Design a protein around this ligand. Sequence first.
Ligand SMILES: *[C@@H]1O[C@H](CO)[C@@H](O)[C@H](O)[C@H]1NC(C)=O
Ligand SMILES: *[C@@H]1O[C@H](CO)[C@@H](O)[C@H](O)[C@H]1NC(C)=O
Ligand SMILES: *[C@@H]1O[C@H](CO)[C@@H](O)[C@H](O)[C@H]1NC(C)=O
Ligand SMILES: *[C@@H]1O[C@H](CO)[C@@H](O)[C@H](O)[C@H]1NC(C)=O
Ligand SMILES: *[C@@H]1O[C@H](CO)[C@@H](O)[C@H](O)[C@H]1NC(C)=O
Ligand SMILES: *[C@@H]1O[C@H](CO)[C@@H](O)[C@H](O)[C@H]1NC(C)=O
Ligand SMILES: *[C@@H]1O[C@H](CO)[C@@H](O)[C@H](O)[C@H]1NC(C)=O
Ligand SMILES: *[C@@H]1O[C@H](CO)[C@@H](O)[C@H](O)[C@H]1NC(C)=O
Ligand SMILES: *[C@@H]1O[C@H](CO)[C@@H](O)[C@H](O)[C@H]1NC(C)=O
Ligand SMILES: *[C@@H]1O[C@H](CO)[C@@H](O)[C@H](O)[C@H]1NC(C)=O
Ligand SMILES: *[C@@H]1O[C@H](CO)[C@@H](O)[C@H](O)[C@H]1NC(C)=O
Ligand SMILES: *[C@@H]1O[C@H](CO)[C@@H](O)[C@H](O)[C@H]1NC(C)=O
Ligand SMILES: *[C@@H]1O[C@H](CO)[C@@H](O)[C@H](O)[C@H]1NC(C)=O
Ligand SMILES: *[C@@H]1O[C@H](CO)[C@@H](O)[C@H](O)[C@H]1NC(C)=O
Ligand SMILES: *[C@@H]1O[C@H](CO)[C@@H](O)[C@H](O)[C@H]1NC(C)=O
Lengths: 467, 469
Amino acid sequence: LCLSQQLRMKGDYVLGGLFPLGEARTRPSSPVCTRFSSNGLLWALAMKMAVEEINNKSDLLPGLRLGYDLFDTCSEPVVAMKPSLMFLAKAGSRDIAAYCNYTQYQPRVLAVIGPHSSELAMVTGKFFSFFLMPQVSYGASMELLSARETFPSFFRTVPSDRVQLTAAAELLQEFGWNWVAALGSDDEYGRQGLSIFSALAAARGICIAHEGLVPLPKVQDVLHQVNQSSVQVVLLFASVHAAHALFNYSISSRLSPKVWVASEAWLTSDLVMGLPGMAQMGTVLGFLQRGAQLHEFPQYVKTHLALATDPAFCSALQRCPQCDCITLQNVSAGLNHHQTFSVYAAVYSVAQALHNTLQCNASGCPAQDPVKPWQLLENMYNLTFHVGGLPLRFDSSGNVDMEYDLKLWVWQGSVPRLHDVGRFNGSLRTERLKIRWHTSDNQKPVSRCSRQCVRRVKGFHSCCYDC
Amino acid sequence: SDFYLPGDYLLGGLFSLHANMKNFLQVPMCKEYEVKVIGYNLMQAMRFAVEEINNDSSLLPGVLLGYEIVDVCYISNNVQPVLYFLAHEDNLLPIQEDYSNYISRVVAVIGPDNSESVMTVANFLSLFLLPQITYSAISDELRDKVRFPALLRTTPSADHHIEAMVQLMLHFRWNWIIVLVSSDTYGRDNGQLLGERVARRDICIAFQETLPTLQPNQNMTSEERQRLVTIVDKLQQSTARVVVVFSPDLTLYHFFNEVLRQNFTGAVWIASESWAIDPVLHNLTELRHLGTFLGITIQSVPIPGFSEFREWGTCNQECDNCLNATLSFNTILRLSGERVVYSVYSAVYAVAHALHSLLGCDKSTCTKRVVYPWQLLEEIWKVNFTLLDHQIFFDPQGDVALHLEIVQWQWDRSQNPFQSVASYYPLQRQLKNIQDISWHTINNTIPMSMCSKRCKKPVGIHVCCFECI
Ligand SMILES: *[C@@H]1O[C@H](CO)[C@@H](O)[C@H](O)[C@H]1NC(C)=O
Ligand SMILES: *[C@@H]1O[C@H](CO)[C@@H](O)[C@H](O)[C@H]1NC(C)=O
Ligand SMILES: *[C@@H]1O[C@H](CO)[C@@H](O)[C@H](O)[C@H]1NC(C)=O
Ligand SMILES: *[C@@H]1O[C@H](CO)[C@@H](O)[C@H](O)[C@H]1NC(C)=O
Ligand SMILES: *[C@@H]1O[C@H](CO)[C@@H](O)[C@H](O)[C@H]1NC(C)=O
Ligand SMILES: *[C@@H]1O[C@H](CO)[C@@H](O)[C@H](O)[C@H]1NC(C)=O
Ligand SMILES: *[C@@H]1O[C@H](CO)[C@@H](O)[C@H](O)[C@H]1NC(C)=O
Ligand SMILES: *[C@@H]1O[C@H](CO)[C@@H](O)[C@H](O)[C@H]1NC(C)=O
Ligand SMILES: *[C@@H]1O[C@H](CO)[C@@H](O)[C@H](O)[C@H]1NC(C)=O
Ligand SMILES: *[C@@H]1O[C@H](CO)[C@@H](O)[C@H](O)[C@H]1NC(C)=O
Ligand SMILES: *[C@@H]1O[C@H](CO)[C@@H](O)[C@H](O)[C@H]1NC(C)=O
Ligand SMILES: *[C@@H]1O[C@H](CO)[C@@H](O)[C@H](O)[C@H]1NC(C)=O
Ligand SMILES: *[C@@H]1O[C@H](CO)[C@@H](O)[C@H](O)[C@H]1NC(C)=O
Ligand SMILES: *[C@@H]1O[C@H](CO)[C@@H](O)[C@H](O)[C@H]1NC(C)=O
Ligand SMILES: *[C@@H]1O[C@H](CO)[C@@H](O)[C@H](O)[C@H]1NC(C)=O
């Protein structure tokens, strides 16, 4: 199919690429992943489309060709460490020096489009921060990546977990539920979410009745503890598997209805959405991202896959050997994926930062020595770049800012569907006159603790009082 | 200098010589931070181990064991040292698909002293399978060898620390405790682990509060002042009198000053391994009125001639104030014995014995063959010897069965600043040999921390809380 030959393209300023193209040792050998993944290939095609259309553009990066070196990294970081080291090696050589600091390096890649997985993103960011390589990531959302003390050169295009956790805390505060129970997955994602939410609650006056962890497929004990307190609101900041397992077990035990606050991980997932009997467990109030999508991306994918089969094109023109023996049906499912826009916007952001750094104007680019990767960081913070006509900005802490949509599960014929009941844009606004609750009548569930009264302190952080 | 000793085989050493005790274009070198005496003491321990190894004609005869000690900050700089260890003598690191035939500058590395930098170093070295023996790293995340094939250890994990805490808690019959964690990952993981372990042994937690990050010798924001005031007020209001603190040794100064100001007295503070042996914190001497302090740390083993050895004595590899800073701590360090120093000693001796077996020499000339790092890693799992009348061998998960110990801080400059009261044996997970403890109570009676006098209807979530009927 000669798709792998297109994973590398020369140019004046090549870019990096770390994608989950493939999935799954007594010797120091890099493991090879043979199984093929459609999501990684779709994201790689998205970045390739972004770079090619940027080269097509005249007023952006005029007279310069933008390259890319797409690399297959499995979910493991051991396989992904080698592409980063190959990134930081000097152009034309396979050796990376270990100098005193970053100023003595001349890396072959201007920037890096970081990994989708957040743990891999942490590893690669901690590696690149020593060389001050500007790395922008798609899909990495865990919060501690925003610490500019230890990640001076890590950006992203998806909102961090702090945004959705602050939205959930504002929802809890506005509706008046100041007696809530918080849960999370045993993985790093849930633990980080819980750690941020405890601080957010303590700042906002709410605090947790019971802060537990639901293990991935124990849960019985966690449900018992949650049931012990008279708490009608439960924030389940968990991955899909943990949320599905908890809901299945609670169905088996016939748990009473509660108001579940959902993270983006399982708010829209069809594994829990299609779980039979889920309708008898209260309204699910979650926050969902409000972002655009690459309208022409499916057309690009289909035309590119049709053209790559032509032997003449391949003659005219490995990282992913499994990527060769594929068909359009093996990637047709994930065509309408949100992360494709995230990758497209990340590539556009790096291109705009490069255009600003060279101080190019519409007619052309002034001639000078190549710009070093660390010189981008000045113009990457506080940068405004237009993606598809929609402006975006990088925060001083390196996270993009975007709105959120507050959705709830409206049950109809055992097929729940989402509905707009609020919009978070830094200050939550809700329309509670159209929310259908789960109680006997359409009345808001009450989960409130008295902070003043005879008193007996109750709560995980000792906030309330059992007057 | 003392950061470099040439020899046939090198031995990388990562130590925390400085800490952040108070613009991304410029990188502040670790030499500008305040000097940490503990890191210099541990480096001196490693150097003493190497020199004693070189002296002996029985262990590694005819091979000079050299080392390239470099300064690693607690978090700040933990990438350049690894890049420098992995490079050749020309400071160039080749990139290739296979590293079987690659020989690096150092044959093994004595890892950093905290979990996060240890994780970073292991993630970087997993490609090369360079053996890395960390000391005083307690994270349970390093136990598994799927993602850390080349990581070993010489201290019991956090599981044994939490077990020792719970066993001490049950021995004196306290079932009502207050847990404090720090905002960093280590405190959060340790607090969660303690909660999970203690929830099944009929001991309840009154509440858990998180101390804000507050490095000493700095002007802290009034928001942090209010947070600390609130935390101490909650500590005083609560009826629990056993406070377990899981935080790095640097961020406790402001908290303890606040507690001292509020005049909160009568609690049995239980320390984690982070500050259970902190000499600069123990030097405050105004915490004697806060109650009794305990802490969990490695069993003391007297290393002969280490105190006299300490007294006689590229980039990010030189510190000058360390000597004049550690001179003032000579007496307390000498009297406190050797707890983590023995961990470093054992790590170096384990590497030496692995190299001795790999070279296959016995009391005579060695074969002096080329040694790849992965071969040394393969031969290091099987080390087994008696070091200072202790047994050193590695579990299937890369841990050494070293006894823990609960120490009670007693303030007497003429005696041991960290008196030992109980010994914990990780092999059977049993805490025994509890000795006399100098309590803070009026008649030296055991402090009582129970939320309910023995009688039965329950009140509140916690099972141990009820009202007698
Ligand atoms: C770039 O423009 C050319 C014509 O100059 C067109 O054939 C090609 O499809 C364009 N590529 C895009 C829009 O990615
Ligand atoms: C949960 O709590 C309710 C109310 O106290 C009680 O009826 C029920 O038995 C408890 N247990 C379960 C498993 O639902
Ligand atoms: C749901 O819980 C039941 C009852 O414990 C168990 O038998 C079943 O396997 C669970 N289902 C899933 C999909 O985990
Ligand atoms: C393409 O799809 C077919 C049919 O499902 C499958 O057998 C094949 O493995 C796929 N190719 C890949 C995954 O490379
Ligand atoms: C734009 O850059 C080009 C190339 O250096 C230069 O000749 C030109 O004067 C600049 N300004 C305009 C307005 O075209
Ligand atoms: C830089 O940030 C400041 C403060 O947020 C803002 O006023 C200014 O417009 C920014 N500069 C840009 C967007 O070029
Ligand atoms: C956020 O939305 C509110 C209404 O909910 C609106 O008044 C406000 O201007 C918005 N702020 C921004 C920065 O868009
Ligand atoms: C980087 O190291 C070089 C070594 O020659 C030194 O001169 C320079 O000041 C350093 N730059 C920093 C620390 O920003
Ligand atoms: C042995 O080591 C000691 C310090 O441990 C050192 O003073 C001495 O020079 C070494 N060699 C001999 C032969 O004593
Ligand atoms: C702030 O820092 C200064 C300078 O070190 C010090 O004198 C002072 O005590 C600190 N606190 C306040 C409240 O000014
Ligand atoms: C203890 O500290 C408190 C709090 O500042 C203070 O009011 C009190 O005078 C101090 N002394 C005694 C004996 O309580
Ligand atoms: C220990 O505290 C005492 C009393 O405040 C002080 O004089 C000394 O400088 C401190 N540090 C030491 C002995 O290292
Ligand atoms: C240590 O302090 C002494 C005086 O107490 C001084 O003579 C010596 O030079 C100092 N050493 C240093 C600063 O390394
Ligand atoms: C190590 O050697 C000692 C002493 O011979 C022996 O008791 C012990 O079982 C050995 N350990 C292992 C793991 O073989
Ligand atoms: C302490 O013990 C002594 C000796 O048995 C006894 O006389 C005294 O009353 C005790 N004090 C208290 C407060 O129990």
